[PDB]
Design an enzyme around this catalytic site. Structure first.
Site, PDB file in Angstrom:
ATOM      1  N   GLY A  13       0.719  -1.347   0.063  1.00  0.00           N
ATOM      2  CA  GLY A  13       0.001   0.005  -0.007  1.00  0.00           C
ATOM      3  C   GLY A  13       0.891   1.326   0.035  1.00  0.00           C
ATOM      4  O   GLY A  13       2.033   1.131   0.457  1.00  0.00           O
ATOM      5  N   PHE A  17       1.822  10.210   3.373  1.00  0.00           N
ATOM      6  CA  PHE A  17       2.287   9.945   4.753  1.00  0.00           C
ATOM      7  C   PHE A  17       3.010   8.855   5.159  1.00  0.00           C
ATOM      8  O   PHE A  17       3.687   8.924   5.847  1.00  0.00           O
ATOM      9  CB  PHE A  17       0.868  10.193   5.409  1.00  0.00           C
ATOM     10  CG  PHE A  17      -0.369   9.323   4.825  1.00  0.00           C
ATOM     11  CD1 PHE A  17      -1.165   9.666   3.709  1.00  0.00           C
ATOM     12  CD2 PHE A  17      -0.325   7.889   5.196  1.00  0.00           C
ATOM     13  CE1 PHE A  17      -2.096   9.014   3.209  1.00  0.00           C
ATOM     14  CE2 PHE A  17      -1.536   7.044   4.607  1.00  0.00           C
ATOM     15  CZ  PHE A  17      -2.184   7.677   3.334  1.00  0.00           C
ATOM     16  N   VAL A  20       3.242   1.050   3.396  1.00  0.00           N
ATOM     17  CA  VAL A  20       3.421  -0.071   3.925  1.00  0.00           C
ATOM     18  C   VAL A  20       4.085  -1.165   3.085  1.00  0.00           C
ATOM     19  O   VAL A  20       3.522  -1.637   1.981  1.00  0.00           O
ATOM     20  CB  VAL A  20       1.885  -0.607   4.381  1.00  0.00           C
ATOM     21  CG1 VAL A  20       1.981  -2.159   4.985  1.00  0.00           C
ATOM     22  CG2 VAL A  20       1.263   0.248   5.186  1.00  0.00           C
ATOM     23  N   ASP A 128     -13.715   3.040  14.053  1.00  0.00           N
ATOM     24  CA  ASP A 128     -13.606   3.012  12.517  1.00  0.00           C
ATOM     25  C   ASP A 128     -13.836   1.652  12.266  1.00  0.00           C
ATOM     26  O   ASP A 128     -12.890   1.173  11.175  1.00  0.00           O
ATOM     27  CB  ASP A 128     -12.545   3.567  11.991  1.00  0.00           C
ATOM     28  CG  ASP A 128     -12.375   4.157  10.876  1.00  0.00           C
ATOM     29  OD1 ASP A 128     -13.566   4.385   9.965  1.00  0.00           O
ATOM     30  OD2 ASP A 128     -11.473   4.613  10.004  1.00  0.00           O
TER      31      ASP A 128
HETATM   32  C1  LIG Z   1      -7.660  -0.023   4.963  1.00  0.00           C
HETATM   33  N1  LIG Z   1      -6.953  -1.119   5.216  1.00  0.00           N
HETATM   34  C2  LIG Z   1      -5.583  -1.184   4.638  1.00  0.00           C
HETATM   35  C3  LIG Z   1      -4.860  -2.378   5.464  1.00  0.00           C
HETATM   36  C4  LIG Z   1      -5.263  -2.017   6.655  1.00  0.00           C
HETATM   37  C5  LIG Z   1      -4.366  -1.276   7.548  1.00  0.00           C
HETATM   38  O1  LIG Z   1      -3.240  -1.921   7.592  1.00  0.00           O
HETATM   39  C6  LIG Z   1      -2.322  -1.610   8.763  1.00  0.00           C
HETATM   40  C7  LIG Z   1      -2.204  -0.685   9.409  1.00  0.00           C
HETATM   41  N2  LIG Z   1      -1.380  -0.212  10.571  1.00  0.00           N
HETATM   42  C8  LIG Z   1      -0.311  -1.459  10.550  1.00  0.00           C
HETATM   43  C9  LIG Z   1       0.697  -0.934  11.344  1.00  0.00           C
HETATM   44  N3  LIG Z   1       1.422  -0.677  12.033  1.00  0.00           N
HETATM   45  C10 LIG Z   1      -0.067  -2.377   9.809  1.00  0.00           C
HETATM   46  C11 LIG Z   1      -1.088  -2.778   8.908  1.00  0.00           C
HETATM   47  C12 LIG Z   1      -1.036  -3.856   8.222  1.00  0.00           C
HETATM   48  C13 LIG Z   1      -0.849  -5.309   8.656  1.00  0.00           C
HETATM   49  C14 LIG Z   1      -0.981  -6.460   8.108  1.00  0.00           C
HETATM   50  N4  LIG Z   1      -1.277  -6.483   6.701  1.00  0.00           N
HETATM   51  N5  LIG Z   1      -1.123  -7.594   5.750  1.00  0.00           N
HETATM   52  C15 LIG Z   1      -1.436  -6.944   4.725  1.00  0.00           C
HETATM   53  N6  LIG Z   1      -1.625  -8.073   3.586  1.00  0.00           N
HETATM   54  C16 LIG Z   1      -2.029  -7.839   2.308  1.00  0.00           C
HETATM   55  O2  LIG Z   1      -1.845  -6.722   1.564  1.00  0.00           O
HETATM   56  C17 LIG Z   1      -2.030  -9.004   1.436  1.00  0.00           C
HETATM   57  C18 LIG Z   1      -1.471  -9.133   0.034  1.00  0.00           C
HETATM   58  C19 LIG Z   1      -2.913  -9.020   0.371  1.00  0.00           C
HETATM   59  C20 LIG Z   1      -1.506  -5.740   4.794  1.00  0.00           C
HETATM   60  C21 LIG Z   1      -1.374  -5.526   6.066  1.00  0.00           C
HETATM   61  C22 LIG Z   1      -1.363  -3.848   6.550  1.00  0.00           C
HETATM   62  C23 LIG Z   1      -6.758  -1.416   6.435  1.00  0.00           C
END
Ligand SMILES: CN1CC[C@@H](COc2cnc(C#N)cc2-c2ccn3nc(NC(=O)C4CC4)cc3c2)C1
Length: 305
Positions: A13, A17, A20, A128
């Site tokens: 992602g 800001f 990830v 949320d």
């Molecule tokens: C709006 N949505 C977007 C993603 C989610 C928010 O994600 C996070 C937010 N804060 C933290 C921290 N510190 C960490 C994650 C995180 C933790 C674990 N994971 N596993 C994924 N897995 C994948 O993208 C898989 C390939 C499909 C993504 C993620 C993202 C809510």
């Protein structure tokens, strides 16, 4: 492609800001997600929120909440190493497969309710909750995410208080959004919708929603315990846990408040492997008792998989 003990693998992602990334912890071989935050690009109040989220993440230890493993701080960049949920968001899974059968939605929903009730035990209100924030691991287990770090699917989950100018702070806000989440799990659709915000608000404040033909009476009786217009009349999650629909096929294993296991900082299996890697016993103990979330503590947590 390198930060601390992690090999940066791919982008999960992006934003202005934060970025990830998927990464591999070199010492253990485990995949983790790393949120990389450029603090110089943050607004006046955004860093206070990020720091509040970090604080909350350090205290949450539930099998259905994304676990934090490490915090790496520099003057300009903050790195948060967390659990990686391989199967993405529940939102996308519902779009891809349609509604879950009540048996499948029950398995997920018991995990979601356990996780949110556990937050409420420690006086943490999500505010949320949505299908976008519910992730799925490799075994299809729920992993709740986002405790501070925007509204692409947020308005359909908003409790009536938001549109009334009333306070939006209590755990009862989460109880409402959990009813919307239960509804989407079993129907693949949202109970309150519209073309614009004016239409959405009218439907949310009216509190009426369609009962899809296939929905069971037990499921609809449970939905009515969450989707109550008056916030003071909404039941606690501890009371809702006793609901009939929640425990169908779990006659032995009744859903009840999660009991966090006691800390174990002296696991000989992990301590021996860490000493072989080059860490000292004192390094391990001080990192764990001080809850440092440093590279030593992160290795101890990552070795628990
Ligand atoms: C709006 N949505 C977007 C993603 C989610 C928010 O994600 C996070 C937010 N804060 C933290 C921290 N510190 C960490 C994650 C995180 C933790 C674990 N994971 N596993 C994924 N897995 C994948 O993208 C898989 C390939 C499909 C993504 C993620 C993202 C809510």
């Amino acid at each position: 492609p390198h930060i601390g003990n992690y090999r940066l693998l791919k982008t999960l992602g992006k934003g202005n800001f934060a970025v990830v990334k998927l990464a591999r912890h070199i010492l253990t071989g485990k995949e983790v997600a790393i949120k990389i935050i450029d603090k110089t690009q943050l607004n006046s109040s955004s860093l206070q929120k990020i720091f509040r989220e970090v604080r909350i993440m350090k205290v949450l230890n539930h099998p259905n909440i994304i676990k934090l493993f490490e915090v790496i701080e520099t003057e300009k960049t903050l790195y948060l190493v967390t659990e990686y949920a391989k199967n993405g968001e529940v939102f996308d899974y519902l779009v891809a497969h349609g509604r879950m059968k009540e048996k499948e939605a029950r398995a997920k929903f018991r995990q979601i309710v356990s996780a949110v009730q556990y937050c409420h035990q420690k006086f943490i209100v999500h505010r949320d909750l949505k299908a976008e924030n519910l992730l799925l691991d490799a075994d299809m287990n729920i992993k709740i995410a986002d405790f501070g770090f925007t509204f692409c699917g947020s308005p359909p989950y908003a409790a009536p208080e938001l549109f009334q100018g009333k306070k939006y702070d209590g755990p009862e806000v989460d109880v409402w959004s959990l009813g919307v989440i239960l509804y989407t799990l079993v129907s693949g659709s949202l109970p309150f919708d519209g073309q614009n915000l004016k239409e959405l608000r009218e439907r949310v404040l009216r509190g009426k929603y369609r009962i899809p033909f296939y929905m069971s009476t037990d499921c609809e009786n449970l939905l009515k315990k969450f989707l109550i217009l008056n916030p003071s009349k909404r039941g606690t999650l501890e009371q809702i846990m006793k609901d009939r629909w929640m425990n169908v096929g779990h006659e032995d294993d009744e859903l009840k408040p999660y009991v966090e296991p006691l800390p174990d900082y002296k696991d000989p299996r992990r301590t021996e492997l860490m000493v072989s890697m080059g860490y000292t016993r004192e390094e391990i103990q001080d990192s764990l008792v001080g809850q440092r979330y440093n590279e030593v503590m992160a290795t101890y947590l990552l070795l628990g998989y």
